[PDB]
Design a protein around this ligand. Structure first.
Ligand SMILES: [Mg+2]
Ligand SMILES: [Mg+2]
Lengths: 251, 251, 251, 251
């Protein structure tokens, strides 16, 4: 309770699934939140469902849109005051092996999953350093930042990139006393409406050969580790990977 | 607040430093706690300093003492009811390279840092499985579970052993639906009275070439990640390593 | 001697430093080699310096040039017969933190270090699978695929991407019995004419806090592990990282 | 050919499987070899099968026997001159979860798999440093040094211990210019007479969910990476893990 007292958080892709759960728990712990998403209909409903405009608002944004990042920080500071906390959560998938990835598919996925995270991390350091905010950048990765999947080649590339790029940012911020931490969160399989819309997906993901716990996670599993990383409880954690995966990567 | 509602925790080496901070925050989040330590004088004072006997008690124990583990679980269940949570934190150091480690030094350190953690983990699974406790075993490791230190050879052996042994235990508990999670916590350098007693230690540990943040941590840095791992907030985390190290292993 | 009997190798950035040493040892072990580089003057001299056109030729190419990859495979097959072996070695550096990386710098580095490796890996799988060649793709990474450097943000992103993308490719090739292995090689600091051209670089790289061996490597250090990975000696190695770094990542 | 010119190698557990293949290829590359094993009948036959006493001899030894290590180094130096190369390969298995490991089973396995490797590594550094031998200690681990197996708890503990202890030894040797490298080798599943003696073992180990290549390795797969690590080709590799596992740990 009040674990994020005074924090101001941007959560990209915060209108659905993991991002929406992070936003919900952030508001419940006293943070002011700006969620982003592609679609006004979904985004405005999502913000209203979590709380009042004094607590949480929506900003329509594609994380691949570099100029839009400036507008997003400006809109969040106008609404809530200086941003302390960024969750780079917006991401897309391509179900292709490296062999069967088109260059179009490659560039489209990296635009969101890599460029978008770079744009958010770079602007976050610039805008949140040296302000005594206890600033925290949480770069959403996944188990595919650690292990290959033969049918997620570009996705693997993006998650490995974010994993190590985040360590570079963590070290530079630490060495320069910027009061900015950077960490990655690595969900395993998480049940969402999108997973429910794919027949057989949850059962395949719940197989003991994939998830040892024999079931998949829920969005709040990722929200709770994000509360810890956004909070001043984690003031000595930077450049670290936090895995919440039901044992996927342990075997 | 009340993040450990109804939990019953054993914390080995809970009378000093990191263990004492874990015990303090566990009680503050509603857990009943049994702390262990070698010395009655230090242990009874430590327990009283955190709370009343209804909240926290001391049990004199060497974690290398196999039979004493049975007495410890029995004393904790008698005091507080069935144990839900074990923090294997008790550990010792030898300041020797592998080359310069005596066999006596090797066996003494592994007795506490490896055998003790095995004894606690094995008994914990046996006593806490299949009871709907949301049981959690937190095996304290360190950055020396990831990276070598040329002057901590036996210590490195013990921390690597606990790191991978914990994944074995996590997987077996998950695959068998034991309702027991096993994770490791990897502190970097943490300021304690013991570190304060070693002239020059903190400044050497705070060098940017060791800890990028340019200072060392405090015991509460490790207490807060332990609250998360003991709590049902981390119900999808098992077989994972949680690093809190000021950037030590990121470079 | 004759460890690469009958192999046909493409080595990108094979006209200088590590790439040139890989080409030299590949020819010395009986492989036919096509080296690539940006500049005809350097490339033709480099090829002639290693051997005769029956052994090694130069092909002018920017690894970021997607269409040029088709011309490169075609030129190599025309010269030497079907390609068995690809070393994605071509790479560039930007000396910027994430904070201080321009979008132009970001895209230029990823074009070579990530897109180029994707283009080479994808085409390599397509052209070398199911031909009984004992095909091997060696994706050059570095220690910056494992650990951050605060002043190599985009470089870190590229090396992490290649590290995990290579595991995806390895798994897909293995599961489909393509007779194609994919592995990454991670040099630490290596002495080259380019390093010699930067005053103070070698001494800074040789500091015990960077390279425990107290000196940097030489190009043949990377050539020898590449001979092993190109050879049928490594027929059970796929999806693996091979580090040759003087202890950099061990501490 | 002659890749181990002038090298003198001790290979523990060198009378069977992986150890015997390492010994065979070491002799074929010009090394003088002392193989160890528990049983004179198997050991003398094994040595004779590889070569003449001028090339390879047997020394009866339990790697858990500390005093016997002194006799082994002395017997090898008497036969072949100063030892340059140690392969700590001797190891045993217990098929138990952590939960179901007896203390007797725990101590018996750690005596060979951990104490034995410590005893060999410590004595190796002492006896091989500062002699211009290009000395190399190769500590045999396995995939169980990286990932848990729910039914190999003590085995996991031993392999994690050796993995990180080896990095400590590597760093100390590097920082002190001892001319001793220490690395670990991590086989996946390897076909041996012992595996052939267990009905169904190879097919279970060859399942795509275990080994992506859909078959297990052969002893020469581990011999070839050991030749590289014993040779001066790997003079810049220390403190590194070398995985040869058919993709096991890549997924
Ligand atoms: Mg390091
Ligand atoms: Mg795995």
């Amino acid at each position: 309770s009040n674990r994020l007292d005074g924090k101001v958080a941007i959560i990209t892709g915060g209108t659905l699934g993991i991002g929406l759960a992070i936003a919900t728990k952030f508001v419940e712990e006293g943070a002011k939140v700006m969620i982003t998403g592609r679609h006004s209909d979904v985004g405005e409903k999502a913000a209203k469902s979590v709380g009042t405009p004094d607590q949480i608002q929506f900003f329509q944004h594609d994380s691949s849109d570099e100029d839009g990042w400036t507008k997003l920080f400006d809109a969040t500071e106008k609404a809530f005051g200086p941003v302390s906390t960024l969750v780079n959560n917006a991401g897309i998938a391509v179900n292709k092996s490296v062999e069967e990835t088109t260059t179009a598919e490659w560039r489209k996925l990296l635009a969101v999953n890599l460029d978008g995270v770079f744009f958010g991390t770079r602007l976050g350091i610039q805008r949140m350093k040296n302000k005594g905010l206890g600033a925290s950048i949480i770069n959403m990765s996944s188990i595919e930042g650690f292990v290959g999947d033969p049918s997620l080649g570009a996705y693997n590339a993006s998650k490995g990139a974010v994993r190590i790029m985040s360590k570079s940012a963590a070290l530079d911020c630490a060495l320069k006393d910027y009061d900015v931490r950077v960490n990655t969160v690595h969900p395993g399989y998480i049940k969402t409406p999108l997973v429910d819309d794919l027949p057989g997906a949850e059962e395949a993901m719940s197989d003991r050969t994939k998830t040892p716990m024999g079931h998949i996670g829920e969005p709040n599993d990722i929200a709770y580790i994000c509360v810890y990383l956004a909070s001043n409880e984690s003031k000595f954690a930077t450049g670290s990977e936090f895995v919440v995966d039901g044992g996927y990567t342990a075997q």
